[PDB]
Amino acid sequence: VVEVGGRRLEVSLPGDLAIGGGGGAAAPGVVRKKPKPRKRGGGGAKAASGDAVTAPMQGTVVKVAVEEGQEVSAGDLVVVLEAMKMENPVTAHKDGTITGLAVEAGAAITQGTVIAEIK
Amino acid sequence: SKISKVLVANRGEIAVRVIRAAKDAGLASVAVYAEPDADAPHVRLADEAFALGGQTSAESYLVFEKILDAAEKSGANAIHPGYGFLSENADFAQAVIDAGLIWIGPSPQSIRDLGDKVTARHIAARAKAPLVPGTPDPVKDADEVVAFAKEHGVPVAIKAAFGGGGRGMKVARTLEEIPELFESATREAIAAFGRGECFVERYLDKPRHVEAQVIADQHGNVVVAGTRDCSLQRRFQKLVEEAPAPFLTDAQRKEIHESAKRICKEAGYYGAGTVEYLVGQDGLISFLEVNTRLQVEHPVTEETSGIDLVRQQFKIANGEPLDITEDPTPRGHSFEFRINGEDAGRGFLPAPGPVTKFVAPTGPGVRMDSGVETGSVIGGQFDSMLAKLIVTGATREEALERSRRALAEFTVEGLATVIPFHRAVVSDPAFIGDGEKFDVHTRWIETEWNNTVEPFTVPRQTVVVEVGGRRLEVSLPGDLAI
Amino acid sequence: SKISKVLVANRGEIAVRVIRAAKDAGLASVAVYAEPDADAPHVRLADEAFALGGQTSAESYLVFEKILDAAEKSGANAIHPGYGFLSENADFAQAVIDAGLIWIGPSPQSIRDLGDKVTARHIAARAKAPLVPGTPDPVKDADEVVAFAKEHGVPVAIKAAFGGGGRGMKVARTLEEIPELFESATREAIAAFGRGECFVERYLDKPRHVEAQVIADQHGNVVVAGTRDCSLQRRFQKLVEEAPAPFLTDAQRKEIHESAKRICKEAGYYGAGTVEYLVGQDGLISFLEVNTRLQVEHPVTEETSGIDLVRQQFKIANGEPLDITEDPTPRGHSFEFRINGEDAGRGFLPAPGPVTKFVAPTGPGVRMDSGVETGSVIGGQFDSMLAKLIVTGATREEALERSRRALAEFTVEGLATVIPFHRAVVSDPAFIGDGEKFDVHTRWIETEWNNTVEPFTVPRQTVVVEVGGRRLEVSLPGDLA
Amino acid sequence: DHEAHIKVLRGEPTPEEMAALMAVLASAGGGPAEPVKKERNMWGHPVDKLRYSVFSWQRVTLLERTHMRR
Ligand SMILES: Nc1ncnc2c1ncn2[C@@H]1O[C@H](COP(=O)(O)OP(=O)(O)OP(=O)(O)O)[C@@H](O)[C@H]1O
Ligand SMILES: [Mg+2]
């Protein structure tokens, strides 16, 4: 907080600020770059490069739309997650055989939990 | 001209209230602060803020030209006082008019006429107020004060011709004690006000304080926007305030209403103002004073009558005629509890400290106007008030139920407060209405209530810089690394 | 609707002269500067000043936007042309009118009709102003150039339509020479201006330049406020002014004024300007210009006539009816000298350098338009002049002795200047006429003058600040610690 | 553009008050911290003062590391 002429200003100063010939910015030879989002690469696939179907967010598995050993095709509904009382469909990313369907209707589920393998 | 920017020459609860009203009206707002207040909420709430410097009110909020310089630097078109400070300084209002700014209040002379309490009694006489039969011009000597009591009958009050705040008010119960009380009260008047001048009045034994809340127009309309009962008091100062005035008959209410109109019409008053009244223990309705400002208690009038009284102040200072012409009808009942850093359990001494927690009450029927928040601090140089809780319902009983909730929901820590007293008094059959009466009086906290509440158990850098024709002090944190 | 804050966008002397005019009038005044000018006398005199940036004039002063941004940021409700740069470009008169700013100058039409001097000749033929007849229209091509030169007779002058400042123009003596001058003129014109419009006319061996000031009103008053003569010239430029115009009889002055009235009415003219003539050594009038900038030659009229001419321009731009309505009688005589940055000891080659000393003359009968100050720096990246010297007296004789002394006083060191040339030419007799005629003619200096001169022997930092996220570039010297 | 700028997060100063703020902050701003001519000079470096057993792994991971790290 600075006063100029008594006017109150709130001023944010960068730590690597250098004006009037100042030094000390990036002191040890720091590199700065745009930080990567906390998500998987997301180009063309995320987890979908693998066989596992994983829950995209925390919720409740209110509907299971497949059975153990069913053949499915990309885009087919696998489960519905109730979250915030919104219903979110989780859907097959590839064709294959539903293998190791790990969940039952009404199970609580967490982001990244494996639902099934399309194998 | 119209206002576009308002400087609020005050702090805390009322500065917050005015800055909020300015944003509602669409007016830009400038705050000011002293050294202890540079992080008070209002400073952050305003659109602009200025340091006054200095570490006391006398070094800060009371210096006329600092506030005018703040208005000059901000470009504020208008100045609004709070309560206290310069709000009733006629010659500061004159300094503002000499600066050409919009003083949000009564004209200097319209103040000055009521600032002198003797001319105030002269004006009440002119205006045909309900009044106590005696009306001394300031007394010559003790033998005249004794003659006054010998004529009008004791109990008798001796009251200074100037001042306020309960300071200049003395009561004599017997004839033989009066001479030393006169000389001492003269000394008190000289010490506080310099004027050794006092008048005398027939005292009323256990009276009830009532007020008219009035909105008054430069174009001669006057609306009695409401009535209040203010009688729950300590040391003649208001602590819980109630609307509407609980137990007057309509004959008395209409007398008070029309008297307040008459008093305004006779003084030529415009702006917001209140007229103070008293009902005696025996039911003698009588005048007391006129306060030349929007009183801090206005919220219970806002909640019962449904009026934004500060925006009315803006309308009047803009010179617009009143929209209301039929006096509003109370659409409910309300209570306002002043919360102060003062320990009711120890005789209401100031007990300042850090506001280490402040969980305000919320929910139905509750309003909070506050000058502090979690992590604020307080000190004896300011009011030691913290906030005003306002509770409302359809009826007195419902508003008391809501208050018995809200005062328990209100949590404050790190300093002592009147909250335990409020929680007690909202529980007291003395204060609960026995249908058409209640027992409290302006002495009730001091003389009747059971007060059983157990007690509570660096410098910044500066540079002086010239920029063209400007002189600019720049002041900064003391350790700015940059 | 009326002038209230004036921005003048030009370098040096004229900026000072018209900022001085504003300072006199009490107008709010705004300057602009390039990097070498960031502490110039004009930026330190003006009430406000704004960076255009850039090291040299051509990087900056040509950009209309860079001007009008500074205009609207300063709130300069009025903009002045001065001389050079945009002062006579209708693009800027348009931009100022569309931006809604007061152009302190003649209207877009009134400039468009006179920036190319060809259009002034095309008016002049109709106005019956004394021509250098040739043809009013340009001839079509070099095939006609040789035929017209053979028909009318060499020498012939070959001129670009925009060749002003004495450098877009050529002369040839013999009928075999002219096609090479016509090609040279066309291709150099294309190199300097892109346009190629070029005209040819019969040359005059001993003309003399004269012009007369004209002031004209939105309420229709017109005044012919004074006269000036520009005979002393070197490398074909105006360098000395003499005022009121000497060695002209009433039989010349008659048409010099009355054709100016006609030609300005035929131009529909309002605002200020001049009409310019070449008079023979035999006194025979012929044309050169009708001129719409405030001529740099203004000081000698400003002293011989009762007008602060740019204050009168303020009133004309105000649309006030003229409070000067009489063709005046100009007092006595006055001389003025352009104080160029050239080494007269070195053939008048240009000479840049630091102005490690500058002292310019004062006192009665002498005036200065100082556009530079001690410790400044000069170079060809901007206009060529340090300043101007101005001299006046009851008659030439007194102003001549005053000129010789003034030029002996006028002292500059750290770079060569033309001041010693002025001292010499104010001593050289041909300039001192007999009372009915005088001997100086064009080329006279570079053909007869006695030369005597001996050769002389942190960066800024930009920081960006944001106010609520609104960008605000700020600049400081590269060190302030 | 990807520089980190100074932000006036609250207030709206005039250009004179901006200039005062900037001239103060710019002359407060630190000088040549982390200086450009911090030479290398390993004479008498503390790692050479220590006793090392002839087989001490710190002869790799401290002594040699400290001499060779550039
Ligand atoms: N006899 C009384 N009965 C009731 N209240 C009283 C009495 N005497 C004093 N008071 C209280 O103290 C105040 C006495 O001061 P006064 O009314 O003159 O000014 P004020 O309203 O306190 O002014 P300011 O806000 O400018 O300081 C009254 O407003 C009321 O609050
Ligand atoms: Mg009162």
TrEMBL record, chain C:
<keyword id="KW-0092">Biotin</keyword>
<dbReference type="GO" id="GO:0046872">
    <property type="term" value="F:metal ion binding"/>
</dbReference>
<comment type="pathway">
    <text>Lipid metabolism; mycolic acid biosynthesis.</text>
</comment>
<dbReference type="GO" id="GO:0004075">
    <property type="term" value="F:biotin carboxylase activity"/>
</dbReference>
<keyword id="KW-0464">Manganese</keyword>
<keyword id="KW-0275">Fatty acid biosynthesis</keyword>
<keyword id="KW-0444">Lipid biosynthesis</keyword>
<keyword id="KW-0276">Fatty acid metabolism</keyword>
<keyword id="KW-0460">Magnesium</keyword>
<keyword id="KW-0436">Ligase</keyword>
<dbReference type="GO" id="GO:0006633">
    <property type="term" value="P:fatty acid biosynthetic process"/>
</dbReference>
<keyword id="KW-0547">Nucleotide-binding</keyword>
<feature type="domain" description="Biotin carboxylation">
    <location>
        <begin position="2"/>
        <end position="446"/>
    </location>
</feature>
<keyword id="KW-0067">ATP-binding</keyword>
<dbReference type="GO" id="GO:0005524">
    <property type="term" value="F:ATP binding"/>
</dbReference>
<keyword id="KW-0443">Lipid metabolism</keyword>
<comment type="pathway">
    <text>Lipid metabolism; fatty acid biosynthesis.</text>
</comment>
<feature type="domain" description="ATP-grasp">
    <location>
        <begin position="121"/>
        <end position="318"/>
    </location>
</feature>
<keyword id="KW-0479">Metal-binding</keyword>
<protein>
    <recommendedName>
        <fullName>Biotin-dependent acyl-coenzyme A carboxylase alpha3 subunit</fullName>
        <ecNumber>6.3.4.14</ecNumber>
    </recommendedName>
</protein>
From TrEMBL, chain D:
<dbReference type="GO" id="GO:0003989">
    <property type="term" value="F:acetyl-CoA carboxylase activity"/>
</dbReference>
<dbReference type="GO" id="GO:0004658">
    <property type="term" value="F:propionyl-CoA carboxylase activity"/>
</dbReference>
<protein>
    <recommendedName>
        <fullName>Acetyl-/propionyl-coenzyme A carboxylase AccE5</fullName>
    </recommendedName>
</protein>
